[PDB]
Design a binder for this molecule. Structure first.
Ligand code: WZA
Ligand code: ZN
Ligand code: ZN
Length: 257
């Protein structure tokens, strides 16, 4: 099974999933000088007040927070998107040290970690059908930089020690995802893929310009998780990110000047 180690890492993924060498792979470096403004882009509309969190779990690749996506309760629309996209879950990527951690980069600069809020296109009826469509998913990427503590992240990090090993889960109710967003909704956007196997190129990427701030104490909690299952030799869950892929002619657009 794939992972982030030397023998099952990103350099190996292409063998089981050839698309790893596709034309629209993610993540990528965002060069502020070549990412131009696109007027056809509409205002980004994030509607999370109706969000119903269900649980939080460790799948061995990171930890996910899932939401009830049976109704158009927590949705994403506007921007470069068509119709509605329902939030289904969010997770993070981080490094072995504060200097690295994010997947995307801004003018070659990495942040301490990165947040991925995953949504699927409701026109495909179901998540399963969505991931297999070029425009099936919309992922809202948000950078995390070390500084002040993010009040809204407290609940998440406080539970981690209860799901240290791969396979552990726990009920996670009443979490409001709005507490993880920065002040500004300014963003960059491009067509790409999942940053992990099966690496399908079904993602419209929306990366926020403004990073949210999290304390050193908070990020360190992430590094307490384990890739491995209970009872197995500990393999700390750090550096669960994928190297940047070639842009290969795709255009990164910005919602601002
Ligand atoms: C939530 O966003 C992801 C979903 C999936 C993967 C990685 C993901 O992370 S990311 N960094 O945002 O690209 C890899 C496994 C992906 C799953 C999408 C749905 C799939 C295709 C299921 O149908 C089976 C395996 C699943
Ligand atoms: Zn897996
Ligand atoms: Zn991700």
């Amino acid at each position: 099974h794939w992972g982030y180690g030397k023998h099952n890492g990103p350099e190996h993924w292409h063998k089981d999933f050839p698309i790893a060498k596709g034309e629209r792979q993610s993540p990528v470096d965002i060069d502020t000088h070549t990412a131009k403004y696109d007027p056809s882009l509409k205002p980004l509309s994030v509607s999370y007040d109706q969000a119903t969190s269900l649980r939080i779990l460790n799948n061995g690749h990171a930890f996910n927070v899932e939401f009830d996506d049976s109704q158009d309760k927590a949705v994403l629309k506007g921007g470069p998107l068509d119709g509605t996209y329902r939030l289904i879950q969010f997770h993070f990527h981080w490094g072995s040290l504060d200097g690295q951690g994010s997947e995307h980069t801004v003018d070659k600069k990495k942040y301490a970690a990165e947040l991925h809020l995953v949504h699927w296109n409701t026109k495909y009826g179901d998540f399963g059908k969505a991931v297999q469509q070029p425009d099936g998913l919309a992922v809202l990427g948000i950078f995390l930089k070390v500084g002040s503590a993010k009040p809204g992240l407290q609940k998440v990090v406080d539970v981690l020690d209860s799901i240290k090993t791969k396979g552990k889960s726990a009920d996670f109710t009443n979490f409001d995802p709005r507490g993880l967003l920065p002040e500004s909704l300014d963003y960059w956007t491009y067509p790409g893929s999942l940053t992990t196997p099966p690496l399908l190129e079904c993602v419209t990427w929306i990366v926020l310009k403004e990073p949210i701030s999290v304390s050193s104490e908070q990020v360190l909690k992430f590094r307490k998780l384990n890739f491995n299952g209970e009872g197995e030799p500990e393999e700390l869950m750090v550096d669960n990110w994928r190297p940047a892929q070639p842009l290969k002619n795709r255009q990164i657009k910005a919602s601002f000047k």
